Amino acid sequence: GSFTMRLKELGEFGLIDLIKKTLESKVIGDDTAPVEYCSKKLLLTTDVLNEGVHFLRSYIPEAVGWKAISVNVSDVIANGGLPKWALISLNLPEDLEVSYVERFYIGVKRACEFYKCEVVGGNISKSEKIGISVFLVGETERFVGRDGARLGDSVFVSGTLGDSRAGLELLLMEKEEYEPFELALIQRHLRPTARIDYVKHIQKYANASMDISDGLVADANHLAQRSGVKIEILSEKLPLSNELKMYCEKYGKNPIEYALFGGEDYQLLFTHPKERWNPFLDMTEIGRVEEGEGVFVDGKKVEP
Amino acid sequence: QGSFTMRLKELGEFGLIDLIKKTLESKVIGDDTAPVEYCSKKLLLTTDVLNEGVHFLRSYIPEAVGWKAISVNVSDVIANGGLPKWALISLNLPEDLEVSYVERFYIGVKRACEFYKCEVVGGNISKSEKIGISVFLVGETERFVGRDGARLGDSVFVSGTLGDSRAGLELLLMEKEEYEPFELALIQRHLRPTARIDYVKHIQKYANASMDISDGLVADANHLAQRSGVKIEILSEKLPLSNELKMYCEKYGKNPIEYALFGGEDYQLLFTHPKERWNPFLDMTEIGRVEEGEGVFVDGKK
Numbered sequence: 001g002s003f004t005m006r007l008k009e010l011g012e013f014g015l016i017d018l019i020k021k022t023l024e025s026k027v028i029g030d031d032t033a034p035v036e037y038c039s040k041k042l043l044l045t046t047d048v049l050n051e052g053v054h055f056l057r058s059y060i061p062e063a064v065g066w067k068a069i070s071v072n073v074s075d076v077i078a079n080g081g082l083p084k085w086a087l088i089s090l091n092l093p094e095d096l097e098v099s100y101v102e103r104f105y106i107g108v109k110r111a112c113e114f115y116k117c118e119v120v121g122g123n124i125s126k127s128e129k130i131g132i133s134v135f136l137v138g139e140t141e142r143f144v145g146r147d148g149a150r151l152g153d154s155v156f157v158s159g160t161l162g163d164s165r166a167g168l169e170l171l172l173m174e175k176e177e178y179e180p181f182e183l184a185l186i187q188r189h190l191r192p193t194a195r196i197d198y199v200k201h202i203q204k205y206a207n208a209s210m211d212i213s214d215g216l217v218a219d220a221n222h223l224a225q226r227s228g229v230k231i232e233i234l235s236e237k238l239p240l241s242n243e244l245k246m247y248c249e250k251y252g253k254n255p256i257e258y259a260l261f262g263g264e265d266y267q268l269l270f271t272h273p274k275e276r277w278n279p280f281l282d283m284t285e286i287g288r289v290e291e292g293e294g295v296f297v298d299g300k301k302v303e304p
Numbered sequence: 305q306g307s308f309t310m311r312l313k314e315l316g317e318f319g320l321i322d323l324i325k326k327t328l329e330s331k332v333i334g335d336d337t338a339p340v341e342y343c344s345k346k347l348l349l350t351t352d353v354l355n356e357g358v359h360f361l362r363s364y365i366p367e368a369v370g371w372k373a374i375s376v377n378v379s380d381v382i383a384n385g386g387l388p389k390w391a392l393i394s395l396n397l398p399e400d401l402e403v404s405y406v407e408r409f410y411i412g413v414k415r416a417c418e419f420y421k422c423e424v425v426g427g428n429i430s431k432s433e434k435i436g437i438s439v440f441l442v443g444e445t446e447r448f449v450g451r452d453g454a455r456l457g458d459s460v461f462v463s464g465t466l467g468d469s470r471a472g473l474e475l476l477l478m479e480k481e482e483y484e485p486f487e488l489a490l491i492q493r494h495l496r497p498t499a500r501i502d503y504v505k506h507i508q509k510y511a512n513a514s515m516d517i518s519d520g521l522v523a524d525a526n527h528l529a530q531r532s533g534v535k536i537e538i539l540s541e542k543l544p545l546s547n548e549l550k551m552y553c554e555k556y557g558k559n560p561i562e563y564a565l566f567g568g569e570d571y572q573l574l575f576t577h578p579k580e581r582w583n584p585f586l587d588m589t590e591i592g593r594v595e596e597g598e599g600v601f602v603d604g605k606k
């Protein structure tokens with residue numbers, strides 16, 4: 001060999017840190033990048049779906065299109081904004097079926113119609129495997145990032161956590177037949193829906209907000225860090241779906257571990273005083289913001 | 305049973321784009337950028353990609369690839385009459401890659417951004433076999449200029465010179481240990497293209513049709529011709545040639561004319577308007593005219 005520092009040694013976030021320093025950037029750090037424009041703040045963000053990593057060519061295309069758009073809107077919603085325009089960059093092999101690309105865009109069209117945004121352009125490049133890069137532009141009257149959490153705030157999450165991971169694992173079992181609750185979980189993993197119904201709430205009362213893409217514990221660490229505060233979470237407060245409970249029962253798994261470390265749930269994690277709570281939304285208080293460092297669960301500390 | 309279903313290779317890049325447009329029932333898709341009405345002005349959205357093994361090699365100076373990544377997207381915005389504001393960079397990276405490669409890439413990206421007065425405000429990092437670079441750029445303009453506004457009688461122009469980038473790449477592929485100064489100037493135009501940000505005002509105020517030359521003059525003229533519903537006629541003898549290019553062709557026995565017509569990645573502008581709107585204080589050259597009909601002609605033939 002020869003020896004020279006490689007990316008695998010720096011870590012995804014150490015690399016981002018370096019990119020930030022080199023660029024001498026100030027906006028880099030949240031789910032979206034807020035820019036000043038016409039008294040409002042436009043929100044720019046991007047996410048990727050790669051074959052062999054986020055999906056397989058065997059997955060139903062329309063669902064992949066839906067997910068592509070959903071995942072980006074999720075970031076925009078999390079920062080208190082509404083999706084407006086999007087571009088889709090595609091890396092495609094010449095052997096892929098035309099109908100695959102067409103069905104994918106039908107799903108894209110469906111999601112855009114649902115979140116009320118629109119794909120206005122994109123790109124095409126030939127490659128080995130399929131690569132999907134989505135760029136989304138949203139807008140808000142008030143940008144809500146990850147460093148505004150206040151001491152005393154309560155910690156909330158939307159819907160249930162852990163579903164996506166169980167669904168993924170079920171997909172991996174490649175079973176010949178799944179029970180209904182299994183199909184529900186699988187569906188939650190394959191076709192997530194961005195919590196666009198929280199936009200007004202987030203844009204109005206949240207001090208800090210972000211979507212949960214990598215898992216509660218891991219994403220809360222990012223939040224606690226930018227806010228320069230501590231966060232106490234209580235296991236028995238974590239919202240668990242019935243299907244998740246049914247899955248853990250059947251496969252001898254612990255529901256709590258899935259709620260804490262399961263990823264790609266695309267729910268929200270935000271903080272504010274308990275009084276701002278809106279019971280019309282399926283939000284659940286799961287912790288609080290104290291002074292200090294790190295993320296704690298039932299008194300014990302844990303990290304990524 | 306077997307498969308008799310159409311695959312991409314057979315449909316082609318543009319045939320695929322047409323399907324996507326039809327499927328999305330889109331009206332904006334079609335130009336170098338996507339103009340969207342916002343706050344009384346027009347925001348321009350565009351994206352381009354640079355993949356390892358296709359557009360560049362891991363052995364190319366990283367900072368140059370970083371400069372080019374921003375430049376080709378800014379060139380698109382420039383072609384439709386706008387100025388770059390913000391950009392996102394989505395990176396597909398091999399975990400085995402040297403961290404310095406990534407840092408150097410962003411150094412060139414940084415330089416490009418300070419030069420074109422735009423800013424990279426975010427992006428993405430993903431694991432992959434080969435390096436994949438996808439940049440999203442957002443510009444603004446007080447007047448969008450697509451590829452359909454070409455009027456009859458209009459004169460056809462181009463900026464700078466043509467065919468340099470192709471000589472540059474051919475030189476690069478020779479993997480020589482050393483190059484002559486004129487050869488380096490050529491390699492330079494291929495590796496570090498400079499977007500014609502100096503033509504913004506002109507394009508925004510007096511162009512009927514506009515776009516940048518990315519795939520080559522003839523190839524890109526066609527997109528302009530059919531998109532406007534006219535036929536563009538060009539005179540090869542009026543094509544702008546550089547000394548270094550003519551220099552390269554003589555030394556290697558090449559036809560500099562073919563390079564100006566089919567050479568790609570020059571990133572110069574191709575626009576139309578009446579001869580009268582010509583600004584002598586810019587390096588534009590008249591290469592032909594917009595006449596009624598269809599298709600592209602050069603010295604009579606097509």
Ligand SMILES: Nc1ncnc2c1ncn2[C@@H]1O[C@H](COP(=O)(O)OP(=O)(O)OP(=O)(O)O)[C@@H](O)[C@H]1O
Nearest residue numbers: 088090121122123124321324333334335336518519
């Ligand atoms: N996957 C896609 N989805 C939606 N629109 C697309 C997609 N791919 C390309 N387009 C649109 O097709 C049109 C032409 O794209 P293309 O990349 O060829 O233009 P360009 O960027 O001008 O080309 P070059 O990069 O050679 O200049 C543009 O409007 C582009 O946004």
Ligand SMILES: Nc1ncnc2c1ncn2[C@@H]1O[C@H](COP(=O)(O)OP(=O)(O)OP(=O)(O)O)[C@@H](O)[C@H]1O
Nearest residue numbers: 016019028029030031075213393395426427428429
């Ligand atoms: N290649 C890059 N260049 C510049 N900034 C980047 C790049 N990649 C990521 N960033 C920025 O680093 C910060 C974190 O990126 P990251 O992908 O973690 O966003 P995210 O919201 O966590 O997405 P996800 O929900 O999928 O985890 C963001 O501000 C992002 O824009």
Ligand SMILES: [Mg+2]
Nearest residue numbers: 031075211213
């Ligand atoms: Mg996120």
Ligand SMILES: [Mg+2]
Nearest residue numbers: 046047048428
């Ligand atoms: Mg991301």
Ligand SMILES: [Mg+2]
Nearest residue numbers: 047071075213
């Ligand atoms: Mg995300």
Ligand SMILES: [Mg+2]
Nearest residue numbers: 012213214215
């Ligand atoms: Mg992530």
Ligand SMILES: [Mg+2]
Nearest residue numbers: 336380516518
């Ligand atoms: Mg172009």
Ligand SMILES: [Mg+2]
Nearest residue numbers: 123351352353
């Ligand atoms: Mg392109």
Ligand SMILES: [Mg+2]
Nearest residue numbers: 352376380518
């Ligand atoms: Mg382009």
Ligand SMILES: [Mg+2]
Nearest residue numbers: 317518519520
């Ligand atoms: Mg092209």
